[PDB]
Amino acid sequence: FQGSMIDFLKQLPHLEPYGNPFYFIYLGIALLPIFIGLFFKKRFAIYECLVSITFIVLALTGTHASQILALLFYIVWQIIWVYSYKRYRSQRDNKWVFYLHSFLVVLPLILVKVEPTINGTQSLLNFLGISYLTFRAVGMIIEMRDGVLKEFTLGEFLRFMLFMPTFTSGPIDRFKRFNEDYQSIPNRDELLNMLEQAVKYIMLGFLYKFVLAQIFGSMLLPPLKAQALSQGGIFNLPTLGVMYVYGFDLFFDFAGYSMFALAVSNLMGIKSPINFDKPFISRDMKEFWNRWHMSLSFWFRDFVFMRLVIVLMRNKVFKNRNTTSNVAYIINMMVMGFWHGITWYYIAYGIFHGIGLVINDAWLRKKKTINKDRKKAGLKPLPENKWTKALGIFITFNTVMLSFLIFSGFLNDLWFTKK
Amino acid sequence: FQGSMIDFLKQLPHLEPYGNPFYFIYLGIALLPIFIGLFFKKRFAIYECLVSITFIVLALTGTHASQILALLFYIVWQIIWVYSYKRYRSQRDNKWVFYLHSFLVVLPLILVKVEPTINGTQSLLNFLGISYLTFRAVGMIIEMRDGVLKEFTLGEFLRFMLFMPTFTSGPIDRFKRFNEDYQSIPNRDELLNMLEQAVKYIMLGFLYKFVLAQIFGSMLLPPLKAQALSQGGIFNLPTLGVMYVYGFDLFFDFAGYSMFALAVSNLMGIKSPINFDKPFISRDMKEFWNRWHMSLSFWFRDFVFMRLVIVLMRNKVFKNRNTTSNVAYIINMMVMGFWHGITWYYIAYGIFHGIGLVINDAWLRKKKTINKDRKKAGLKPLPENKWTKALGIFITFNTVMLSFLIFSGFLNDLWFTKK
Amino acid sequence: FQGSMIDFLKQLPHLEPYGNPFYFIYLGIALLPIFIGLFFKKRFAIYECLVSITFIVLALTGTHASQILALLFYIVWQIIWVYSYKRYRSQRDNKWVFYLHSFLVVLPLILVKVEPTINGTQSLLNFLGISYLTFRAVGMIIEMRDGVLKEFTLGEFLRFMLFMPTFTSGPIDRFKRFNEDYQSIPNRDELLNMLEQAVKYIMLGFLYKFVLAQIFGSMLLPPLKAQALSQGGIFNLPTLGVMYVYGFDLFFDFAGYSMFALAVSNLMGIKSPINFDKPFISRDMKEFWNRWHMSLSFWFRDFVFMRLVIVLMRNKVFKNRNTTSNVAYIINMMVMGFWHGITWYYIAYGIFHGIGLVINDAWLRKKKTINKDRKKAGLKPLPENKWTKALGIFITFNTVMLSFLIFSGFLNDLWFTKK
Amino acid sequence: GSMIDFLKQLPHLEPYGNPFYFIYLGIALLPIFIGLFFKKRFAIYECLVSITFIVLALTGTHASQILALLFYIVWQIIWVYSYKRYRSQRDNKWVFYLHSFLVVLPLILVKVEPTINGTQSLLNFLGISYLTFRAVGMIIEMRDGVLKEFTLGEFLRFMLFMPTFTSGPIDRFKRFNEDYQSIPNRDELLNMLEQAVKYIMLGFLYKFVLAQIFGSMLLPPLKAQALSQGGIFNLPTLGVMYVYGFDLFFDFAGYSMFALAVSNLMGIKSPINFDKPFISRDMKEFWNRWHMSLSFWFRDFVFMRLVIVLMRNKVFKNRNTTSNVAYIINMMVMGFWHGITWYYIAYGIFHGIGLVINDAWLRKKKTINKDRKKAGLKPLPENKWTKALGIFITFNTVMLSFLIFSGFLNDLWFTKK
Ligand SMILES: CCCCCCCCCCCCCCCCCC(=O)O[C@@H](COC(=O)CCCCCCCCCCCCCCC)COP(=O)(O)OC[C@H](O)CO
Ligand SMILES: CCCCCCCCCCCCO[C@@H]1O[C@H](CO)[C@@H](O[C@H]2O[C@H](CO)[C@@H](O)[C@H](O)[C@H]2O)[C@H](O)[C@H]1O
Ligand SMILES: CCCCCCCCCCCCO[C@@H]1O[C@H](CO)[C@@H](O[C@H]2O[C@H](CO)[C@@H](O)[C@H](O)[C@H]2O)[C@H](O)[C@H]1O
Ligand SMILES: CCCCCCCCCCCCO[C@@H]1O[C@H](CO)[C@@H](O[C@H]2O[C@H](CO)[C@@H](O)[C@H](O)[C@H]2O)[C@H](O)[C@H]1O
Ligand SMILES: CCCCCCCCCCCCO[C@@H]1O[C@H](CO)[C@@H](O[C@H]2O[C@H](CO)[C@@H](O)[C@H](O)[C@H]2O)[C@H](O)[C@H]1O
Ligand SMILES: CCCCCCCCCCCCO[C@@H]1O[C@H](CO)[C@@H](O[C@H]2O[C@H](CO)[C@@H](O)[C@H](O)[C@H]2O)[C@H](O)[C@H]1O
Ligand SMILES: CCCCCCCCCCCCO[C@@H]1O[C@H](CO)[C@@H](O[C@H]2O[C@H](CO)[C@@H](O)[C@H](O)[C@H]2O)[C@H](O)[C@H]1O
Ligand SMILES: CCCCCCCCCCCCO[C@@H]1O[C@H](CO)[C@@H](O[C@H]2O[C@H](CO)[C@@H](O)[C@H](O)[C@H]2O)[C@H](O)[C@H]1O
Ligand SMILES: CCCCCCCCCCCCO[C@@H]1O[C@H](CO)[C@@H](O[C@H]2O[C@H](CO)[C@@H](O)[C@H](O)[C@H]2O)[C@H](O)[C@H]1O
Ligand SMILES: CCCCCCCCCCCCO[C@@H]1O[C@H](CO)[C@@H](O[C@H]2O[C@H](CO)[C@@H](O)[C@H](O)[C@H]2O)[C@H](O)[C@H]1O
């Protein structure tokens, strides 16, 4: 009964998800049948499972391929605790039972994020996309609590949670929208539109991830970081250079992956949510969060921010609505900071963006009352000319790049600050 | 460049039939056109012949490449002794001529299974599928005897006997059914259903052979064998452990191969017989043999068991039907053991399964008699509760595991008896 | 001037025609637009020229790439001496002008086949397929002489004489049939049938040239020749073995090339004449020549044998028809041997097959008169059964293999010279 | 490290250098052609292909020209939109000249810097000689009012056109937009495909066979012999003149046919550059066949406009003198565009004097033939000998002009440069 099982699942192929461009050959061929079936309004639901599982396994068979075993636990864990809650939802509905089931479903993510802090080493039950899978699972539990979701077969649950195109770190879905878009196969014209969009997305993702991302990450970023460390001090010009370069590199890499995921999802007939829609032209933090990682930000607005606001207003803990909104903004942004990983700089980034949103709300209210005062006094309202827009875009870009500098983790290297 | 032809044959590539998963890619592409051809009403004879011969040669070459020659002669032998009977079938059917033709058809198998016993090491005639090929050949000499087969060209004969997805050790087939199933190409929707079933079979075979068969074969079996040998004695708990582990490994490996073969056959538009249908849950041995190796068990039921019962009743050797049935069961299982190989443990396995079958028949008769006795006495019949079903399943499973342990040959190493 | 263009010609890319399976990928990709255009009843007549010229150049750019220059002379020769007849043909029909034009058109072939005998070195005009282009370039003139051929554009001439699929050494065409097949594009059903036949031919050509031809030529033939030379003497068993092996190798290589050429021609929409149709079941010399290199044998029957018979009968040189037929057979076979090449063994092969045809005609006449005599005398006609047919097949096969032994040129090494 | 050396690291694919480049281009352009078959445009795959091939053609040993290209693109966009915003209000007849000068400023700097101290400017790149002609086009078409609206996509798609980027045929805006927006039907598309295949084959023949023979086999030894003999003139001078002229034609026509074929595979038929020029009887009819795109461009936007400017100011008394001056100035400006050296300007002035002499001879011939018809004498016959004489003299003058333009006359002599 030797425990050489880890060695068994290590010589398997390691086809990287969106690695070399030739990958899109294999997947393309593997997606040739399913897409054809969509033209005839027929869904295989078996060959799709085969291709999804094969590509997930090829993606997860890395140097630390043992993570596959974690998956074979994680899935089971979710299947244990989602369905259990459903059984309870058949009989009764209590706040504490829902809280316990949600906490148990999100527990693997909590362990993966916390264990490197306490023990200092990666947790056993960690794999490539556990930061983007639990968001589906807990989401379904939430959809049970509100009563929107009542019944679903296991095939639907597993084909939703373990979606291949958006598995590693991709757009975050919900169960209602995904299921409704999976049941009703779109007609031929919309299918052809989606095919054209998918080809365009594949080409754009090639450009983003294989040209711009490589240039900004593996060519300028290392020498810029080394020069910044050599300069030393609290701040310097190389710090600004690395801030801007890393911000652009992060955006380009994430947008390239998102385009790849959207293209592959379209090739299966499903319209996954978009992530980035020109986020750097944003002229305000609130508008920025409607552009940067749209799936994640919208998910947190739907399930973490709005529900917290409702809870706070139900108990009327805070008198004015503005104070409740500010508190909920800070809590939501801090929690979003936690999701990346509980360190000093990720939590700093979360609180930073929370403070930014609070300042944005305060400035919106103050601008409204100042416009009212000026209009009442006969003066014209504040100018909306190109100069004001340029100033707003510049301020937003500077704040976003400062946030991406803190989030970059470069402040741990520049300043050896333990906490 | 060649030296001896055997070395040149060894030079040829060796592709294990259903070995690495990558193998399924090759056949997949090799089966891509033909399957599409099944959608329409045409079949590519030349392509099918070429792909079948190519994969047969690839499976036959390797360290024992000379076996290819043993195949070729064998083929001629069959063509020598099948068609001859056909000509004789045109004139008359004397029993002794039919017996002689059947014996000459199955003579290569007799020599292959005899030569290792009674001195010697191994016969030159032996090759990969010789154990599962004569069943097809003697599958026609019998049918000619019954008169249900009259005409067939060489193309049909060799296309059936040299079937590629069922060559190495696959679901034993019959001629009439195979010809009737290949003459009529199935419709489009049935073809899509067959494609889905083939994909499910491929996935399940992956699970059955490359995951669980590996675990039960190369992880637990060697340590359990070592512990059992170290313990010694007539028997011990490690013997029970190795019995259970080997039985599971054998079932999983055989089911994986059979599902692979059925999937590849379905991709060729032909529905080969199913070998395994949920064993280990059978209440009775007689109902176990309708689920374990279904193709071979049904073959022996049709062409060996029932025919022998007819022969015995024609000469009315025994007084009652029950004795004839018992003797037929014993002879059928003994012939199965002989087909497996003429050793001590294979014959022990055959005799033990025959004993199980006859005891099952006797117990069924006794239970029917006692139920009649209770019915005529007014007493409630013996309970058929879930506990009785569990008891029957447990007894059948234990007997099957013991039979597999005997068939393993591990008992021979353990005891060294009858060496 | 420098004269270094030959060196330039040696740095062009090289692609052996039907050399590798990957060559068919390029060929199919290039010919797909032509097939699609055929499906819609359209011929580009320019893209075809481009693909044909590119593949001819890639085939002719071997180690002796200078042969390309010879082609750039040969065409400029043939055109000059084809149209020179066409202008004259409209005016008058003097026999000597036709003889002179035919001789001048066949002159490059005469030089290529003669110069290696006189000077001992390859002639300048020689290139890959002159012996299979002079036939078309003299068939055009012969058709002009009969008056069957009339006004035709240069495009038709150059697309007929320089046909890409049958350029190197392929099926020999005529102009009228090829032109009529080129003008009338076949319907969609015939196009599908031709595509299926072409795929079958490609697979069979793979089997013949890349498997059987290699085995019979590069593996057994050199050892057999070496052992035959070591044995020495006028005749020996290794010589018989190498005779049979080389006969099979020659047939398989030529049939593989012919099937490749037929497939590629079918992909262009025209069906070139077949070359081999089971030559080794001939049962007679006449039925052998109606099966062995059918395009060449039929060409020589149409334009060399029949015309010679007509010439001899017009002047009634010989008293009876049989003498004229025998003389024409001998002359035709000697001229075929000449066309192969002016060596002792090629002329021996030609005159040998001529003697064979003569004695076959004598045997047919004697069998006819003997059957008549036996029928008149009441005796049964001589049997025509399995054994008689087998004896005829054996005699024909032995004579053909002796002919291919003489034609092999092995006699020059064994009998004459020293080794 | 990302530097100029990093730009030099990128692969270099010389435009229309080897047939494998054509295989690459055909494989890349096939989807665009099939899409145009069904009357749709991608506007993204086209941009990616164009940018990729431009970069590959630009990433040579001196690959620092991509920065020059980016600076040129920014400069052209800035000044074109500056004029467009200004044209909406009013035209002052001098702001147009200022904008035209600021648009041609990169070109004039690139053509002046080599001949001022020692070297070309840093902003020079591959196709700057054939790109400015498009930019000024826009400005010209804004002055006449025939162009009013265009987005950035159309403008950059027209200026950064891939098939005619390096030295391909010079286009105009209005025609290019009219041809791009209206995709041709299926049958005309097939005809264009056949013409493109014919162009590819003929370009193969022109550039990869004949140009190689006339450039690498005869030109070096002929130049060597001409230099060895020396003197003002010699028979090897005539040999090198003829060989260089044939090499120039068989190379430029091959490249132009390649560009036209690649453009046709993208559904746009760029203007034909060469239509058998050597058979032209007269000098004036020669310029309608040799470098047709460039000659027509200079006829439309440089010659006729200058004639109009001179006539509206009535500087000269009669039309003939104005036409002569316009011809001389047009040919001199073409010579300047080629490069500011002694032999390019000599070539321009020589072609100008050829044009004016041709005009004068045509007028004199018309007058003398009118007098002959009045006097009863039959007009001079032209069936086979007069036409041959005209063709021969035009060909001789063209060959001499090409010899002067060759720059070999500079090596042969040591005249003041
Ligand atoms: C009704 C009132 C009239 C008032 C007077 C009108 C006068 C008009 C003057 C227009 C000046 C335009 C200035 C921009 C073009 C300069 C052309 C030039 O110099 O040649 C170029 C060659 O041509 C081109 O590449 C583009 C030519 C087209 C220019 C079109 C601009 C607008 C013209 C409109 C009116 C045309 C009048 C005649 C223009 C020559 C580029 O130079 P190069 O590299 O050959 O070097 C020569 C350099 O100047 C010497 O150092
Ligand atoms: C449904 C049909 C389609 C399903 C998928 C079909 C395509 C499957 C491709 C499997 C092979 C991928 O081929 C790829 O080759 C590369 C480069 O050699 C290797 O790549 C990998 O090698 C080994 C693991 O094998 C690792 O140590 C290494 O880090 C990694 O790069 C692997 O062998 C495989 O990842
Ligand atoms: C330490 C905390 C982090 C630093 C925080 C910095 C971010 C603060 C907010 C960003 C600046 C917002 O400042 C200013 O906001 C106004 C008011 O909406 C924006 O103005 C805009 O508002 C909205 C768009 O959302 C429109 O309806 C309005 O017409 C337009 O003028 C300006 O574009 C921006 O210049
Ligand atoms: C490695 C082992 C190699 C040995 C295997 C060799 C391949 C098997 C050869 C089979 C015989 C080929 O010769 C065969 O002759 C028979 C004569 O009826 C015909 O056979 C035909 O029979 C059926 C009857 O419906 C046709 O539908 C079919 O198209 C074809 O198979 C063909 O002409 C040819 O297929
Ligand atoms: C080699 C040594 C022996 C090997 C084992 C022998 C075979 C296995 C034990 C005998 C079979 C056990 O299973 C036996 O058949 C079935 C299945 O539960 C039960 O009985 C079943 O069949 C009888 C037939 O009369 C029905 O009336 C009854 O309703 C049904 O439950 C028996 O009560 C049980 O005793
Ligand atoms: C629409 C038209 C389509 C045209 C089809 C494509 C034509 C061009 C094909 C690719 C170019 C030729 O590709 C060819 O590849 C072979 C690989 O064996 C190489 O050529 C080789 O030829 C022989 C045989 O293989 C070798 O012995 C030799 O050493 C080498 O020159 C060159 O790389 C090139 O000659
Ligand atoms: C319209 C035409 C339809 C048929 C089109 C497709 C048929 C041709 C397929 C070509 C497949 C690839 O072509 C060839 O395949 C062989 C098969 O082992 C492999 O390579 C083979 O040839 C190469 C070179 O000759 C050898 O070095 C090698 O040992 C051998 O295996 C490669 O994969 C590729 O060189
Ligand atoms: C240097 C000489 C080279 C030539 C060598 C020999 C060339 C071969 C030709 C010899 C004849 C063989 O062809 C001959 O055909 C005749 C008539 O069809 C048949 O002749 C045979 O069959 C007939 C019945 O048909 C019977 O009378 C008898 O059994 C026999 O004559 C045989 O098929 C074969 O004997
Ligand atoms: C080698 C260096 C290359 C430098 C960069 C070259 C790329 C430059 C991109 C120019 C286009 C940017 O311009 C922006 O693009 C979008 C999206 O394409 C255009 O959007 C649209 O424009 C045209 C206008 O008819 C449409 O036909 C087209 O479908 C679409 O592209 C907008 O008009 C413009 O807002
Ligand atoms: C470097 C200095 C300049 C070099 C020379 C440049 C001019 C070269 C051409 C000079 C001759 C003009 O060429 C002349 O063209 C005219 C019309 O164009 C042709 O035709 C004209 O003359 C013929 C003479 O028979 C008459 O029919 C009629 O007057 C007219 O048609 C002449 O056949 C040709 O001789």
Author numbering:
A (entry chain D), B (entry chain C), C (entry chain B): -3 to 415
D (entry chain A): -1 to 415
What did the authors write?
DltB, a model member of the Membrane-Bound O-AcylTransferase (MBOAT) superfamily, plays a crucial role in D-alanylation of the lipoteichoic acid (LTA), a significant component of the cell wall of gram-positive bacteria. Through biochemical analysis and cryo-EM imaging, we discover that Streptococcus thermophilus DltB forms a homo-tetramer on the cell membrane. We further determined the cryo-EM structure of the tetramer form of apo DltB at 3.42 Å resolution, and DltB complexed with DltC at 3.50 Å resolution, and in complex with an inhibitor m-AMSA at 3.23 Å resolution. The tetrameric organization of DltB provides a scaffold for catalyzing D-alanyl transfer and regulating the channel opening and closing.
Significantly different from the monomeric crystal structure of DltB16, our cryo-EM structures reveal the tetrameric organization of DltB. Each DltB protomer in the tetramer is almost identical to the crystal structure of DltB monomer, with a root mean squared deviation (r.m.s.d.) value of 0.4 Å. In the image processing, application of C4 symmetry to the refinement and reconstruction did not yield better resolution map, indicating that the DltB tetramer adopts a non-4-fold symmetry. This observation is also consistent with the following structural analysis: Four Phe36 residues of the four protomers form an approximate rectangle on the intracellular side, while the four Tyr22 residues on the extracellular side are more twisted. Each tetramer features a central hole. Of note, a central hole is formed in the tetramer, with the two closer protomers about 12 Å apart (according to Phe18 on the extracellular surface), while the distance between the other two protomers is about 24 Å away (according to Tyr22 on the extracellular surface). The central hole is surrounded by the transmembrane helix TMH1 from four protomers, which is almost perpendicular to the membrane, with hydrophobic residues Phe18, Ile21, Ile25, Leu28, Ile32, Phe36 facing into the center of the hole. As the tetramer is a dimer of dimers, there are two different intratetramer interfaces: the intradimer interface (A-B interface between MolA and MolB or MolC and MolD) and interdimer interface (B-C interface between MolB and MolC or MolA and MolD). A phosphatidylglycerol (PG) molecule in the substrate-binding site may serve as an LTA carrier.
